From a paper:
Receptor binding and immune escape have been recognized as two major drivers for the evolution of receptor-binding domain ([name]) of the viral spike (S) protein, which is responsible for receptor recognition. Receptor binding is a key step for [name]-[name]-2 infection. In this study, we evaluated the binding properties of BF.7, BQ.1, BQ.1.1, [name] and [name].1.5 RBDs to human [name] (hACE2) and determined the cryo-EM structures of hACE2 in complex with BF.7, BQ.1, BQ.1.1, [name] and [name].1.5 RBDs, respectively.
Compared with [name] [name], [name].1.5 [name] only possesses an S486P substitution, but the binding affinity of [name].1.5 [name] to hACE2 is ~2.7 folds higher than that of [name] [name]. Q493 of [name] binds to K31 of hACE2 in the four out of five complexes except for [name] [name]/hACE2 complex, in which it was S490 of [name] but not Q493 binding to hACE2 K31. In addition, [name] N487 also forms an H-bond with hACE2 Y83 in the BQ.1.1 [name]/hACE2, [name] [name]/hACE2 and [name].1.5 [name]/hACE2 complex structures. In the BQ.1.1 [name]/hACE2, [name] [name]/hACE2 and [name].1.5 [name]/hACE2 complexes, [name] N477 contacts to hACE2 S19 with an H-bond. In the [name] [name]/hACE2 and [name].1.5 [name]/hACE2 complex structures, hACE2 H34 forms an additional H-bond with [name] S494. P486 interacts with M82 through VDW. However, the hydrophilic amino acid S486 cannot interact with any residues in the hACE2.
Author numbering:
A (entry chain A): 19 to 614
B (entry chain B): 333 to 527
The structure:
Amino acid sequence: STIEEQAKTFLDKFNHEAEDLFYQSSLASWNYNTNITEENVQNMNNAGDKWSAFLKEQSTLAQMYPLQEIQNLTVKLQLQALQQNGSSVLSEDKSKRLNTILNTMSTIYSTGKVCNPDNPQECLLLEPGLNEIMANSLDYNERLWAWESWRSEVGKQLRPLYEEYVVLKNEMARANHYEDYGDYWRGDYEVNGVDGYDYSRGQLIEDVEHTFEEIKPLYEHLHAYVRAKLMNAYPSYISPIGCLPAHLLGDMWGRFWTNLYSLTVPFGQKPNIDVTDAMVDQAWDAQRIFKEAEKFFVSVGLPNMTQGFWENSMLTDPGNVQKAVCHPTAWDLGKGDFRILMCTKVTMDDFLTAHHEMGHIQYDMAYAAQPFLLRNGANEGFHEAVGEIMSLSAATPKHLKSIGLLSPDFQEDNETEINFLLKQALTIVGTLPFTYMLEKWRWMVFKGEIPKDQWMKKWWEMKREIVGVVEPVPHDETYCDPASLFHVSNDYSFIRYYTRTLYQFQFQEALCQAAKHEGPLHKCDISNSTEAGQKLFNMLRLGKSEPWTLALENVVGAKNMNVRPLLNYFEPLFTWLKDQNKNSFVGWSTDWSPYA
Amino acid sequence: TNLCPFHEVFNATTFASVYAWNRKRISNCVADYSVIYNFAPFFAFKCYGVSPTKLNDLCFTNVYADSFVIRGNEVSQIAPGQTGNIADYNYKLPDDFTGCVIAWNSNKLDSKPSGNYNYLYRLFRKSKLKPFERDISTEIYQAGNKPCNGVAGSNCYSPLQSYGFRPTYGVGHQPYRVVVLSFELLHAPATVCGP
Ligand SMILES: *[C@@H]1O[C@H](CO[C@@H]2O[C@@H](C)[C@@H](O)[C@@H](O)[C@@H]2O)[C@@H](O[C@@H]2O[C@H](CO)[C@@H](O)[C@H](O)[C@H]2NC(C)=O)[C@H](O)[C@H]1NC(C)=O
Ligand SMILES: *[C@@H]1O[C@H](CO)[C@@H](O)[C@H](O)[C@H]1NC(C)=O
Ligand SMILES: *[C@@H]1O[C@H](CO)[C@@H](O)[C@H](O)[C@H]1NC(C)=O
Ligand SMILES: *[C@@H]1O[C@H](CO)[C@@H](O)[C@H](O)[C@H]1NC(C)=O
Ligand SMILES: *[C@H]1O[C@H](CO)[C@@H](O)[C@H](O)[C@H]1NC(C)=O
Ligand SMILES: *[C@H]1O[C@H](CO)[C@@H](O)[C@H](O)[C@H]1NC(C)=O
Ligand SMILES: *[C@H]1O[C@H](CO)[C@@H](O)[C@H](O)[C@H]1NC(C)=O
Ligand SMILES: [Zn+2]
């Protein structure tokens, strides 16, 4: 019995005792998301506790068929998934303390309360309140007040407890046999064993830093244009020679620049395809919206949705009789059960979100034949890329003209197509440098390259070099600004979004080239193209059974990641930006403080 | 015709597990496959060795009845030349089979919201299954090289596992009631057939 015929079996019993327990937890979670009651919480707790106990028992029993003697890259990925001492390598008096740290951070972040330097009654929390005050306000002092108040009350009470998280998590990383906790998170991008497709853990460090170079010229021009358009909004507040205050970006932490469209609209006085009026005019409902989408995915050759989706999936808000969490989510309960939970309204945004979640179910359905442990995306940046390429395909005016949402003339003049490019760029181009900055900071605030006393002196120096923002008022060392973000306060990897963004455009260009599309890439609809659907499916099917390198190559033909596809998507906007930036200044000086 | 219980087999309150596999000798009246084509649409009607209508007009020496319920995606494994969990470790069909396979969904009858764990199938076997042969036994199966003494644990496993049917399962996992019929010839004179 080679340890390859004592691990072939073990996994056969795991695949059957895991499906039932995962299905029962998924059903309990779905029931709680249907009714928010007291019994449903108890059912969720029981199911989750049983599932976690089974996982822990199987993980403990696993480690027993050593790694070095298996030879079947597949029976070995499953062992990698099961053999893994996360937070069980620590002493019993340390794991509880770490869990207390995470629980305290989550509680502090969720129960935020700024209050006013005046009437001690109003105590605006995060959502809503602060998110609203940063979204639809044009004052300067008020936004500065909110920005400083959130990071003053919340920031101080989160570092003494972050400084102790950066010790225990690192020590655990040294125990499970890893270099560092950042190296722990850069682990799903690690592939070993197959010749010609390897990807070292430190290789991503170089790949990201090499891809952000071929972006600087576009982001720099976009930043210059945004600064020029923001001059008139805040006259005596921004200098042309250098950066933009970090509290004037329409988003609380600067993650997205979407709320600046109303201030930086290009050729305005020309609306964007909004078919919401036609929705009310032609009596459209959620069932018809989801029917329309099954029709898009049956055009590209991919399959229909089982009757179980139609019978067991809530699509409209029940009302005041029930309490449900209105949040678009695609559910894969397993054992042939697929559901989508969303409170649908007659809008174009919900029309696109339906396609997004429907693409999520088609991926999930694609790899249903794989073993339990491999039923996931190739990495953390493929599941959200084909949920968003379909939104781009559906948003095209040609697709909307083929289903009866626009009058069949709708002259596709170049005046209004550029307003769509800039708005679409304010959520893609404006978030990649922020993600790279945050991930680089977190990565080196672990390898010990930034000693504690310098945690918040390097941060505001990185945000003046990599991105174009500057703090409004000085922050001493006792603050902790990154912990104000949702992902930093919790334990979530943040580099997945950069990879998602750079993979979605590669997939889009590959599919459009496979569809014999002629013209600009942003005018591409992948409907009525069987070849494109077949090419995507040959990637959607594998899941984790093969390295993500081969999965990417099966569609784009490239061995690794690339930023060229995304700069080809933005060529007209880039040329126009160069055209209107001749009289302006491109670039920034890392020395203009909105506080001397 | 004497009306063999072709309506007591294809009509019962409860069947047996995948690994038991009951067997009545029927062979007592005139074949009445007309009702077989009736009684709800079928997921598969895959007679190998004869043709439907062609039947109700052939003298068979003995027609053995065999009954069990399996999941949807595993219905295709009841066929010659097929390798699978059911084929290798439960009921086997010979490569020279001649008969009919009748399967239809039974979600309303053999499913419960909590779960139906009364139907059992074997997963591991220290050898393969010969044609038309049963094997009932709970003897623990040893994976490693340390004998176990019939106790669960390290590289030690209990064979037969439970299904756990639920009404919300997909088409491939919903219960599918399957009846497979047998057709062999013997030196005895043929009497069990229609005029
Ligand atoms: C996708 O194709 C359908 C079906 O069109 C047929 O198949 C095409 C590949 C091509 O060969 C057509 O000539 C075929 O008729 C389109 O649905 C039709 O669209 C036309 C648009 O002029 C309309 O007149 C028909 O009534 C439609 N037929 C229907 C709805 O049953 C569909 O528009 C195509 N999608 C696009 C172009 O985005
Ligand atoms: C890996 O194991 C599976 C299951 O035993 C087997 O089917 C497969 O052929 C193996 N991979 C190869 C090609 O060695
Ligand atoms: C898919 O769904 C559409 C609309 O529900 C239906 O008309 C069509 O027959 C289905 N096609 C297949 C192959 O299931
Ligand atoms: C759009 O096309 C016109 C016609 O050639 C051209 O003059 C103009 O510069 C282009 N740009 C816009 C959007 O005005
Ligand atoms: C809550 O709502 C679900 C869905 O309609 C229903 O099936 C269930 O019986 C309800 N439970 C309670 C708490 O009444
Ligand atoms: C962690 O679990 C035990 C703890 O002693 C150890 O023997 C085992 O090798 C470790 N698992 C790993 C690092 O794969
Ligand atoms: C037996 O029960 C089945 C299932 O309800 C029914 O369709 C059939 O007519 C019955 N016939 C008998 C009594 O054999
Ligand atoms: Zn999504």
